[PDB]
Design a protein around this ligand. Structure first.
Ligand SMILES: [Zn+2]
Length: 250
């Protein structure tokens, strides 16, 4: 999950839970087995970068999504991974599966958990100059590592990292110092995530149709949509990269 998925999940949970009294709060995490927020209203569901917070009563349920489809809404219980939490209201059910962190924090201090985050690409008070100065603060830093650092700005994961590198004509190992305009980079990242904040069908090309949605990610061996050259890929290091060797040069 990247920042768009997490924001969208927060929105889906808001539709299911926000403003409603919890009828069930079953936290299947050992330290939190005794938490039972039933009888409290879910006052707010919000995202902070790749983090989710569910505020109810005096508590804030903090989760960090490692798996797409991590929170599921509806009454179907069959799932590919372990159910870690069930929340219900009179009319709705939300289940959290394969969550990374799932913890119950004090509501009043819940933002201390994530106060170090850089500007949130999908947060209400986004600040592109802060993100741009953070991104450019160390010009010898490799571009992809800087984009993926949640203290620089919050929300880019491997898909958006690959896509941003393509639209700016840079290899992921290019130093940030080679960017003509770091402000433009972070503004385009904001625009890309914003366009997908309510779209699970992640699209960066402007064309949402099947097979048309991304420039390079997941497209090894397919033609670049601009120059026609076949897309290349490398699976060394942490993350898989995809790039057009004509549009993205050293
Ligand atoms: Zn190309």
């Amino acid at each position: 999950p990247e920042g768009d998925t997490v924001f969208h999940t927060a929105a889906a949970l808001r539709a299911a839970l926000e403003g409603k009294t919890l009828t069930r709060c079953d936290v299947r995490v050992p330290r939190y087995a005794t938490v039972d927020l039933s009888g409290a209203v879910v006052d707010e569901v919000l995202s902070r970068g790749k983090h989710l917070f569910i505020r109810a009563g005096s508590a804030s349920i903090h989760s960090h999504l490692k798996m797409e489809g991590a929170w599921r809404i509806g009454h179907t219980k069959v799932a590919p991974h372990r159910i870690r939490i069930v929340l219900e209201t009179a009319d709705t059910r939300a289940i959290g599966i394969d969550l990374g962190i799932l913890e119950v924090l004090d509501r009043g201090t819940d933002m201390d958990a994530v106060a170090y985050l850089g500007p949130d690409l999908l947060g209400p008070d986004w600040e592109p100059r802060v993100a741009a100065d953070n991104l450019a603060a160390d010009p010898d830093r490799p571009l992809a590592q800087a984009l993926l650092d949640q203290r620089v700005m919050a929300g880019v994961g491997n898909v958006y990292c690959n896509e941003l590198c393509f639209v700016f004509g840079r290899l992921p190992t290019a130093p940030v110092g080679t960017l003509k305009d770091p402000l433009r980079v972070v503004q385009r990242a904001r625009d890309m995530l914003w366009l997908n904040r309510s779209r699970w069908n992640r699209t960066t090309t402007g064309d949402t149709r099947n097979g048309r949605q991304l420039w390079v990610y997941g497209r090894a061996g397919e033609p670049c949509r601009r120059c026609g050259t076949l897309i290349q890929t490398d699976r060394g290091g942490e993350r898989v990269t995809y790039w057009c060797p004509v549009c993205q040069t050293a």
